[PDB]
Amino acid sequence: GALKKVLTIAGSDTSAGAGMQADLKTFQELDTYGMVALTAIVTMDKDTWSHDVTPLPMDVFEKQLETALSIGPDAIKTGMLGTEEIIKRAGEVYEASNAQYFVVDPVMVCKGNPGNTEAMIKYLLPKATVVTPNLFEAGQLSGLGKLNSIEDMKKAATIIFDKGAQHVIIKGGKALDQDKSYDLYYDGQTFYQLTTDMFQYNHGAGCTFAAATTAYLANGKSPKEAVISAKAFVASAIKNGWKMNDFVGPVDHGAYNRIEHIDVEVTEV
Amino acid sequence: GALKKVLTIAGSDTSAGAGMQADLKTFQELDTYGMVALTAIVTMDKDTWSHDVTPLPMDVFEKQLETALSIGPDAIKTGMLGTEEIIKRAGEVYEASNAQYFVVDPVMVCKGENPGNTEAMIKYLLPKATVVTPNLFEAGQLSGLGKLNSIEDMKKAATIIFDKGAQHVIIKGGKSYDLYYDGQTFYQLTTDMFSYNHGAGCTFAAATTAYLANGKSPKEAVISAKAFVASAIKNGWKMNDFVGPVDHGAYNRIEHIDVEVTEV
Ligand SMILES: *[C@H](O)c1c(CO)cnc(C)c1O
Ligand SMILES: *[C@H](O)c1c(CO)cnc(C)c1O
């Protein structure tokens, strides 16, 4: 039947591994109609790879929103938002829409502000179907600071959930363990640990995971299935990522469908 | 082997049917690594679908090109360029890269809705173009023939545009004829006729570009891109009362449509 319409409110990653590029790519891979409202443009210097974030004026941000909103998204994802104004508006449009799914990837960092954090806490967490911080973002969102363990991650998730998020996944990434990738998923009742092997290039892993979750929810998976299916999606992308230069390599967003499925072990902790 | 890297220099079609959205989606469908240097942001009024083109500052345009060029595209496509200076830089970045394929979709109009720009395309892009993909209006402008009303006028247009330096020319007729010309032979490309065609041209040029990057001859790339876009068109859907985009994934997901090829 008709493609589900999935909007991302996000920034452009010129390198095309992350940000709106990941979102659109992943939305397409998962057979949904992808759309974007750009908040910012990120570029990288040719010699050093230093990032430059160029914000987009609010008037064009709002023009993009009006269009994308008239089209009627079934699910919304947010990525790099950049300002409290934008953060606040991202929240407002979700509520104003007929969308049933709101996936918040609380971007703070790229590979290669309590201000925005508080605005994220205030305006986004209470409407979030799923929120997907990495280890660093989870400690900020929870106000616990540096999380060192599965049990600290459990603490962070309860705190974030109690601030309004219906479902929380914290990516433990290379910080928690480096032989295995652990994420902690929490739904208010039970803590699930999600585990896959590690092999290697993971630029855009985060966005891709949040983008896949949104598509999976748009297409009818429960948040649990959606998160688990997204972890598998991104694990394959990560395994088959490629070297772009001396600083970075993107995930291969098409790997799950074109190369292989990777097993995600799920356990209660 | 590694994913081929394909750059599009284009604008954002907020409706996500055409422009860079169509490009990236098409690029992804054809197993290539798609990238974009954004030239502008196109938005549409909710009530009238009036297009508003917000250009991006030239400084951010150039920072995006610097990053895309360091990554090293295997192929470059152009879409909406908007100014004669954007037109010139697009050609220059093609020449500066090690890219072997330059596909120019000389966009002048959008589904739903400067001859100085037309002159700029003729001077800067056409001499570098592996493939140029005008619709009927754009071909009449690039050729200077004005409104093309027949396969004879299209043949003339294609000859003129080839003579301006484009190596392969396809004029989309808009039954369902496209005219392909390589300098030696005129091939009429046809399928059955199917109105949710928003982004068909971008998708066609984007698929052409990916096919070329993945090793198909220009003839085969065009024929393959036509089948690709025909499926997308056939499976387009109604977005609102003004427009309906093509289904970029329809070739892979839904069905494969045969292209009839005939010399003319
Ligand atoms: C950074 O690379 C990045 C992210 C996080 O990976 C999200 N969005 C944009 C535009 C980025 O550049
Ligand atoms: C128009 O919708 C359009 C075209 C031509 O189809 C190309 N690029 C952009 C950004 C557009 O909006």
Side-chain angles (χ1 to χ4, degrees), chain A residues 35 52-53 98 101 145 155 158 173 240-241 247:
Chain A
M35 297 173 282
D52 191 341
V53 182
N98 294 327
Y101 313 105
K155 210 189 305 268
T158 313
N240 293 277
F247 304 97

Side-chain angles (χ1 to χ4, degrees), chain A residues 10-13 18-20 40 42 44 51 79-80 107 109-110 203-204 207:
Chain A
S12 176
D13 162 18
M20 67 98 160
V42 187
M44 298 78 180
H51 284 41
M80 173 172 293
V107 169
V109 185
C110 284
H203 175 48
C207 301

Side-chain angles (χ1 to χ4, degrees), chain A residues 14-17 20 25 28-29 31 33-34 43-46 49 52 63-64 66-67 244 254 258, chain B residues 14-17 20 25 28-29 31 33-34 43-46 52 63-64 66-67 70-71 237 239 253:
Chain A
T14 304
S15 73
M20 67 98 160
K25 290 180 191 191
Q28 190 61 36
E29 282 295 331
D31 298 321
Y33 187 74
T43 55
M44 298 78 180
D45 171 280
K46 57 175 165 136
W49 221 241
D52 191 341
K63 288 170 183 167
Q64 293 174 88
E66 162 182 338
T67 309
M244 168 169 286
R258 165 174 28 82
Chain B
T14 304
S15 70
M20 68 94 181
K25 292 174 186 194
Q28 190 61 36
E29 285 295 327
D31 309 314
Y33 184 82
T43 59
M44 298 85 182
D45 180 278
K46 64 183 170 124
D52 184 353
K63 286 186 215 185
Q64 290 182 86
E66 187 185 308
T67 306
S70 82
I71 294 172
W237 56 276
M239 172 175 279
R253 169 166 25 78

Side-chain angles (χ1 to χ4, degrees), chain A residues 147-165:
Chain A
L147 308 187
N148 275 46
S149 69
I150 290 283
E151 79 264 6
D152 292 343
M153 293 163 71
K154 291 171 71 170
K155 210 189 305 268
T158 313
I159 290 163
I160 294 154
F161 175 100
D162 282 358
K163 286 163 157 166

Side-chain angles (χ1 to χ4, degrees), chain B residues 11-13 18-19 42 44 51 80 107 109-111 198 202:
Chain B
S12 174
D13 163 21
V42 183
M44 298 85 182
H51 284 35
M80 170 177 286
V107 1
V109 199
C110 279
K111 297 126 278 211
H198 170 50
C202 292

Side-chain angles (χ1 to χ4, degrees), chain B residues 1-112 114-174 176 178-191 194-264:
Chain B
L3 290 169
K4 301 283 180 182
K5 297 158 284 166
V6 181
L7 175 62
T8 187
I9 306 168
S12 174
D13 163 21
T14 304
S15 70
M20 68 94 181
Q21 289 79 348
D23 294 337
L24 297 177
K25 292 174 186 194
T26 297
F27 297 164
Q28 190 61 36
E29 285 295 327
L30 299 168
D31 309 314
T32 61
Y33 184 82
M35 325 170 274
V36 50
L38 298 172
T39 57
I41 297 184
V42 183
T43 59
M44 298 85 182
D45 180 278
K46 64 183 170 124
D47 301 322
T48 75
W49 223 243
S50 180
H51 284 35
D52 184 353
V53 180
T54 304
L56 282 171
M58 197 56 28
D59 58 13
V60 74
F61 175 62
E62 294 282 355
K63 286 186 215 185
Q64 290 182 86
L65 294 189
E66 187 185 308
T67 306
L69 169 68
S70 82
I71 294 172
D74 297 303
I76 302 177
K77 175 203 137 133
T78 71
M80 170 177 286
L81 296 186
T83 79
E84 300 165 48
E85 173 173 3
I86 289 163
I87 289 158
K88 177 169 173 151
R89 292 291 301 123
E92 294 172 345
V93 50
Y94 175 68
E95 270 220 324
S97 65
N98 297 334
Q100 16 184 46
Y101 313 108
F102 193 42
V103 180
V104 179
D105 180 16
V107 1
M108 294 178 191
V109 199
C110 279
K111 297 126 278 211
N114 186 244
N117 286 357
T118 296
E119 279 317 323
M121 295 184 213
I122 282 164
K123 304 201 316 187
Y124 301 113
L125 303 182
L126 292 191
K128 301 185 186 58
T130 306
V131 192
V132 71
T133 66
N135 62 37
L136 204 63
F137 172 81
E138 291 151 346
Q141 293 302 287
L142 287 174
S143 68
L145 297 172
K147 188 156 191 288
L148 304 175
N149 285 277
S150 68
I151 301 296
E152 285 295 345
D153 301 329
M154 288 167 89
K155 287 179 74 167
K156 200 175 178 175
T159 296
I160 292 159
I161 294 167
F162 174 91
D163 295 353
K164 258 64 166 293
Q167 306 163 356
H168 298 268
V169 179
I170 172 135
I171 306 181
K172 298 162 280 163
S176 190
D178 302 339
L179 187 75
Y180 171 51
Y181 181 57
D182 60 3
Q184 297 303 121
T185 315
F186 293 98
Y187 301 96
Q188 174 178 322
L189 306 184
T190 199
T191 81
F194 335 100
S195 75
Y196 306 133
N197 63 344
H198 170 50
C202 292
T203 298
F204 177 81
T208 301
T209 310
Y211 283 131
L212 286 177
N214 288 328
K216 285 170 174 198
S217 65
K219 193 197 186 188
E220 291 305 305
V222 163
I223 294 174
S224 292
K226 179 51 167 297
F228 190 87
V229 80
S231 291
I233 295 170
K234 182 183 172 301
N235 293 289
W237 56 276
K238 182 173 183 102
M239 172 175 279
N240 52 41
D241 284 316
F242 309 100
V243 84
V246 300
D247 181 342
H248 312 81
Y251 181 85
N252 293 322
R253 169 166 25 78
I254 292 165
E255 66 190 299
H256 308 266
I257 308 296
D258 294 318
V259 185
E260 168 173 26
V261 184
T262 71
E263 291 178 22
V264 298

